[PDB]
Design a protein around this ligand. Structure first.
Ligand SMILES: OC[C@H]1O[C@H](O[C@@H]2[C@@H](O)[C@@H](O[C@@H]3[C@@H](O)[C@@H](O[C@@H]4[C@@H](O)[C@@H](O)O[C@H](CO)[C@H]4O)O[C@H](CO)[C@H]3O)O[C@H](CO)[C@H]2O)[C@H](O)[C@@H](O)[C@@H]1O
Ligand SMILES: OC[C@H]1O[C@H](O[C@@H]2[C@@H](O)[C@@H](O[C@@H]3[C@@H](O)[C@@H](O[C@@H]4[C@@H](O)[C@@H](O)O[C@H](CO)[C@H]4O)O[C@H](CO)[C@H]3O)O[C@H](CO)[C@H]2O)[C@H](O)[C@@H](O)[C@@H]1O
Lengths: 729, 729
């Protein structure tokens, strides 16, 4: 190709104006095969310039000067200057050195993490460049490990500046796009490390129904298999492939009962102790792998071994899939050691994801992160977080930052996994976040005390949790459409603010704030409430424009940074003027696709929403106050329109238009009602409540209402009253 | 042997069902010679199974699967699964990797340590396996360094599960048993970094006699030799081999005076500056080593050099031994550097211990720990601890944990060495521990203010220290018998609780609690007293059974964890129902073996004690209330019997039996007396003392006495009163 340049023992491939592959080969042979990370090096031709001399070469694109002075790659021989001024003297890459600016990526797991842990770098940098080293093995055409690359150094220089979305799109072109998820993955999951019977598990699923809590997924954790019943001469019961017949005397019948309730079923698999002589599948595996059964030779875990993988999928997983298991929860915690040098977690995710496609279309796994490119094997499983406010306060930042290495389907244990402390408010705040996260999977530890069942908690917490769990199912149309946009266009569901606002310093100063699809901006509360206010809070950055609370219609004039206060039952979620959000009207109704959509419209601007579905596309347009709905294919779907406060159209079939210029634009939300509510719940003196209500009612000029609250001895009460005054300005 | 298997470049020796030697050789030659660590690879034949294929081998014992996949040893090629379920997924060893569970061992020294320091691993693990790498040089048949092993990797896989005692016994079979100590080592030692004269040292020894404090050992620290008198052109006076003639004008006469007082004599040796031209032995050493005397060439320390070692033992130590020095205090702090790569401390301990056997039977050294196997060279010398509560609080744990690498004769500076802070209670608590430690050596810094003389302190502290120092000599029969059991049976004097109680979680949660021989359980107090109670405390775990305070007879019903309180003059030491403890009746009497033994019997169960001595064995049996004493050889020894409270038999000669079924079983200890004493010393309100005494006297039901103390505003006073109520239940 003209986009390929050799010089000395190096090869440079200009993939885009902003993406250069850099290779070294001692043998003069360079690597064309795919790697664990890289699936495609076919990119459209681009323009660039070369200055080639006897001893040096310079490659010049629109955004980078790449220099190579010959010899072995060192910090002195291989380096690059970006054509940006984001920093005064951090604009140079040196081979093998770190520079400032990296916005980070993700890490394998949150196992045993109480609050923050270090993250690996991603491809995004405030200074406009990042290097992604390809240290993986080569693949065969069909995707097996083939051994060591002939490019003994193989790097990708990203020089996208602050065009983060294009960097991620081209990363997906290089490493392969995320596959489409199935719609069932986006609903509520039930999980608990608890020794249920068939009977008690079905009773709990029927209790969810009775309690008006929708579920898509039934997880069965490790007590599905033999645990205490494993003879100690075999080691532990952690690994198992044999049903506990006391708890599950007829597994296929039990899975049939979950399938009748329209649940997908996954089992915990701890693979590390392989298939030992006590297991139900051992006689078949022993025959296939020529094991010495009289010496009870174990089929040890070896995902480098083709015969072991086949016996694992066909003879261990196969019989359980035949009983009705839909997909695998790969729960690997036993290290990164293999003879090949390939991480066993990568071998599991790669081969299990491929194998899951045999029995179900667009099937998933649930497994820990296995390095760049492992987004090809959703879903991410973050693991055994400590139950704490600190863990919750880390998790929104963790989730949005992961988009910077393309790993956009993290499933966290909602409410935290293990250890830590009881606080029903922490559980409720964690579920609020979960509902506005990639995946909403309730899960917990082997404690008698850590169930995430809403009715574990008091009547107030229970009702709020049920409301949020129903909201998750209302959001499935929006989530599923965003899922198809991840798969087809390389856009993350969850974006850091700086994807949309790369030049706004405040977009880098609100770690836990994020965009959730294209219509919603989320600022989860992740700190225990101030007991004097009976409200939690978060500092929200409002970009330029008019914003509304998604739930209340409270307005906010951007651009501003403003501390916002919510009761424990309420979450800060915002939509711009012109936002259109579809909701399932019937979130409890078991049906493959919604028979009714609510179109929720935020007044004050034009807007547009495209609802992508399995077998349709539906466009909602809001232009000069006219709302139009069209679809590619006709259906019997009934549309409901909510314009600000008011239901305008109820259950209307087919394509249509309706003029909303005549209809009431304003939400009900008002300063006086909100003021009364905040004062009434506050654990402060009644004389202070009386004086604030009287003075804020009497004082007419906005600037003098603000001067009055500025005198308040309660600093946080000032900020809460200021939020109401700012919204009422 | 059938217990030897070769595969690829590896050799496996199945020494026991639970102990496998693992070797790699590039040359096809494997090492048969002893090493610094290993003295014996002769073990009885055991059964095991092999699965040998073209490319892999598996060795199977009762407790482990050892796997080798060929090639160089890596974490992927060499690994093992234990046949235990102590953990869920920590049951696998990977070559070159650490696993969880190791119960730790010991370290070189406590020099400069204020409280805790890190320890090396031992051979004991809660998860049931440990690997002991042999990185040492090979020895010749006579025990000189021979150079590098031909087994370039040489490992010992221990897979004993929680059979800790058998692991230690087989460790001693591999590395050699601890030698027998001489009886004199088990008495009190006097030491102080102080510039005594012959006259002032003998005056102090005569003051110990006048004060009723028995001593076995007189240590003379470095001011025995020239210090300030060394010309600075030679360096410091730290190393010296020349008596300071002002302080010791006739050394042999002074050592004769200590020998007449039945004291063994040791001198401090700082070897690192060798024999310089100012030293008294230099002319002889210079002649032997062909040194240039006109250029004052030093005989530099070089324990790799046979001629240097001979001149050191024969011409430097020899003349001092001829003046009467009994054994050497090797005080090495100058690093681990030698041309051979052997630690100079190991060369000193190995060669000096061997050389000490020439002039005295079962002789000792006193030196720092020199790695696994250095238990062959007792005694351990922990060195320059900081004088602090933190240092004392670490030291029982330090001492019992050392049994996990077989190093069972640690001698700590009792009361701490240097720096730190004055607190007479810390000195007293430290001496209590010392008396129930392997060796009771009083030692201190060059301060005018740090003498460990009991009469340094007030009358209360002095009398308590004298009482504990007399108790050490009462315990010499018990210590000496346990010493012969260490030497012959590989059982440590000091055991962690988990040796006796491996499956009790509480045996891992009382770091400072230990078994002291087979009849006593010690819980030293290592925290400053609560001034409101005038008592210190420690949480004691009482195993199943009936336990008695060794001193008071206070009873405790196991199994329970219970906070116990003692005045600063009293130490928590416990014996089970049926315990028999021999004591010297005449601890001040100078005699090679006791002319009278007290047999102290704890009622309520059968018991047995075997008193091993230099030239006898005496068995005390307590069966169905009959006490019998028999001996292998007749003697004129007089036996005293104390059954619980009461002396039954006084000074009875020969073998005999006596029925104690008719005699009073109960100790005097009673709730009311103990209650009055605790209230009386407490620095609390008299109205609280009055109310507690009155209410606990009046309230009859035990559960209501406990309910009354539960209302007390003083939390620690509750726990102290609860201990009395628990003992009185
Ligand atoms: O010759 C000038 C000066 O250089 C050396 O000291 C520097 C020091 O004064 C200071 O300078 C920074 C600038 O680097 C520039 O930084 C911005 C930063 O403020 C922020 O806006 O973010 C951008 C983007 O990331 C930065 O690049 O301007 C600011 C003022 O706002 C100056 O403070 O810091 C740098 C880095 O530590 C120093 O190199 C020199 O030592 C000194 O003697 C001299 O006067
Ligand atoms: O599939 C189950 C679970 O596995 C992963 O998370 C684990 C996490 O739930 C937790 O589990 C432990 C168990 O490991 C077991 O541990 C005991 C320990 O309690 C104690 O008794 O001492 C023994 C001996 O040393 C341990 O082996 O049982 C306890 C309950 O008492 C569980 O808490 O901790 C481990 C280790 O961190 C996790 O691997 C998985 O991430 C999770 O999603 C899943 O539900």
């Amino acid at each position: 190709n003209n986009n390929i340049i050799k010089f000395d023992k190096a090869r440079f491939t200009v993939l885009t104006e902003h993406l250069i592959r850099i290779e070294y080969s001692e043998t003069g042979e360079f690597e064309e095969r795919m790697t664990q990370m890289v699936q495609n090096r076919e990119f459209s031709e681009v323009n660039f310039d070369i200055i080639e001399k006897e001893e040096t070469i310079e490659i010049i694109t629109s955004t980078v000067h790449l220099y190579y002075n010959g010899g072995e790659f060192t910090n002195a021989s291989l380096f690059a200057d970006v054509k940006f001024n984001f920093s005064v003297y951090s604009n140079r890459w040196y081979f093998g050195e770190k520079s400032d600016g990296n916005l980070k990526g993700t890490t394998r797991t949150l196992d045993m993490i109480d609050g923050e842990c270090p993250l690996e770098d991603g491809i995004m940098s405030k200074n406009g460049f990042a290097v992604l080293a390809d240290k993986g093995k080569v693949l065969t055409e069909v995707g097996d490990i083939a051994g060591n690359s002939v490019s003994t150094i193989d790097l990708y220089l990203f020089a996208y500046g602050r065009d983060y979305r294009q960097a991620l799109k081209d990363f997906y072109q290089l490493t392969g796009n995320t596959p489409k998820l199935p719609r069932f993955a986006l609903g509520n999951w039930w999980s608990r490390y608890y020794d249920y019977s068939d009977k008690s598990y079905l009773a709990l699923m029927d209790k969810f129904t009775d309690k008006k809590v929708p579920l898509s997924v039934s997880v069965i954790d490790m007590d599905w298999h033999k645990v205490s019943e494993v003879p100690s001469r075999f080691g532990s019961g952690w690994t198992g492939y044999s049903w506990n017949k006391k708890l599950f005397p007829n597994p296929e019948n039990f899975i049939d009962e979950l399938h009748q309730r329209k649940l997908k079923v996954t089992l915990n698999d701890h693979p590390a102790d392989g298939i030992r002589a006590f297991e139900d599948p051992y006689p078949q595996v022993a025959q296939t792998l020529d094991l010495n059964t009289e010496l009870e030779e174990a089929a040890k875990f070896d995902f480098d071994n083709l015969k072991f993988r086949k016996a694992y999928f066909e003879e261990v997983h196969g019989p359980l899939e035949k009983e009705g298991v839909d997909f695998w929860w790969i729960d690997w915690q036993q290290g990164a050691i293999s003879k090949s040098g390939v991480d066993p977690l990568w071998l599991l995710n790669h081969y299990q994801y491929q194998n899951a496609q045999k029995k179900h279309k667009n099937n998933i796994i649930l497994s820990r992160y296995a390095g760049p490119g492992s987004h090809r094997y959703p879903l991410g499983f973050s693991g055994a977080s400590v139950i704490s406010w600190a863990s919750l306060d880390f998790q929104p930042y963790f989730t949005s930052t992961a988009s910077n290495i393309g790993y956009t389907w993290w499933s966290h244990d909602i409410g935290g996994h293990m250890q830590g402390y009881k606080d029903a408010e922490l559980s409720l705040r964690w579920l609020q976040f979960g509902v506005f996260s990639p995946i909403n999977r309730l899960h917990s530890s082997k404690s008698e005390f850590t169930s995430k069942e809403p009715w574990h908690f008091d009547a107030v917490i229970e009702q709020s949790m049920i409301d949020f769990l129903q909201l998750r199912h209302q959001l499935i149309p929006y989530l599923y459409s965003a899922n198809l946009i991840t798969a087809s266009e390389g856009r993350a569901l969850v974006e850091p603010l700086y994807y949309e606002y790369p030049m706004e310093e405040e977009a880098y100063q609100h770690r836990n704030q994020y965009l959730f699809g294209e219509q919603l901006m989320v600022a989860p509360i992740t700190e225990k409430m101030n007991s004097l206010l009976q409200m939690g809070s978060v500092e929200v950055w409002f970009p330029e424009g008019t914003w509304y609370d998604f739930f209340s219609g409270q307005p906010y004039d951007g651009k501003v940074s403003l501390k916002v206060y919510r009761e424990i039952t309420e979450m800060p979620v915002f939509a711009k003027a012109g936002a259109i959000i579809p909701l399932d009207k019937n979130p409890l109704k078991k049906e493959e696709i919604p028979s009714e959509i609510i179109w929720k419209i935020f007044p004050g601007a034009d807007g547009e929403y495209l609802l992508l579905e399995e077998d349709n596309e539906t466009k909602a347009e809001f232009v000069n106050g006219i709302f139009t709905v069209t679809s590619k294919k006709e259906s019997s779907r009934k549309h409901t329109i909510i314009y600000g406060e008011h239901e305008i159209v109820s259950a209307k079939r087919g394509e249509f238009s309706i003029d909303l210029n005549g209809k009431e634009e304003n939400f009900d939300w008002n300063f006086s009602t909100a003021l009364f509510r905040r004062l009434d719940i506050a654990e402060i003196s009644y004389e202070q409540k009386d004086e604030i209500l009287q003075q804020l009612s009497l004082i007419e000029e906005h600037e003098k209402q603000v001067a009055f609250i500025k005198t308040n001895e309660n600093q946080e009460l000032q900020n809460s009253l200021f939020e109401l005054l700012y919204s009422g300005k």
